């Protein structure tokens, strides 16, 4: 039993809700919140910009030190950093950005990072400003993640379409 509330159950391990991931994280304080990161951990917009804003830019400060030490992530890769005031940990995961021409096959590799964590609050990878089809992202999530994932979908219209079209 966990404290996630109001989710629709899609499969044995995947749950979904129309919610602002920032507000969900502040309420639940999950062990792991997933960020829709880029390889430079530049949290300018989309989910990343919103999460970073909610940390008063502390996420960005920590991220800049991480990059200065380690260099950029790989597309499809991840790193674990602090969750600041939102969660114990933030798993920064880089899905392919279609608006940069990156290979959508890397979306499965991106979701594989979730399997290193027993329970996560997450957005749909590569959705939103990353330019991928969110219906496809949900399919890859369900077919790749085996740990317990609670998906927050900001857009109510999109949430309804994801549920109604889910196979
Ligand atoms: C795939 N898209 C991208 C972003 N988005 C979010 N989902 C949850 N929390 C969020 N905070 C800022 C954006 C955002 C959904 C659309 O409302 C899904």
Swiss-Prot record:
Inhibited in vitro by GRL-0617. It is a multi-pass membrane protein. It catalyses: Thiol-dependent hydrolysis of ester, thioester, amide, peptide and isopeptide bonds formed by the C-terminal Gly of ubiquitin (a 76-residue protein attached to proteins as an intracellular targeting signal). Residues 1-167 form the Macro domain. Changing residue 164 to L: In strain: Gamma/P.1. It is found in: Host endoplasmic reticulum membrane. Responsible for the cleavages located at the N-terminus of the replicase polyprotein. Participates together with nsp4 in the assembly of virally-induced cytoplasmic double-membrane vesicles necessary for viral replication. Antagonizes innate immune induction of type I interferon by blocking the phosphorylation, dimerization and subsequent nuclear translocation of host IRF3. Also prevents host NF-kappa-B signaling. In addition, PL-PRO possesses a deubiquitinating/deISGylating activity and processes both 'Lys-48'- and 'Lys-63'-linked polyubiquitin chains from cellular substrates. May form homohexamers. Interacts with N protein. This is Papain-like protease nsp3. It comes from Severe acute respiratory syndrome coronavirus 2 (2019-nCoV). The chain holds residues 1025 to 1191 of 7096 of the full protein.
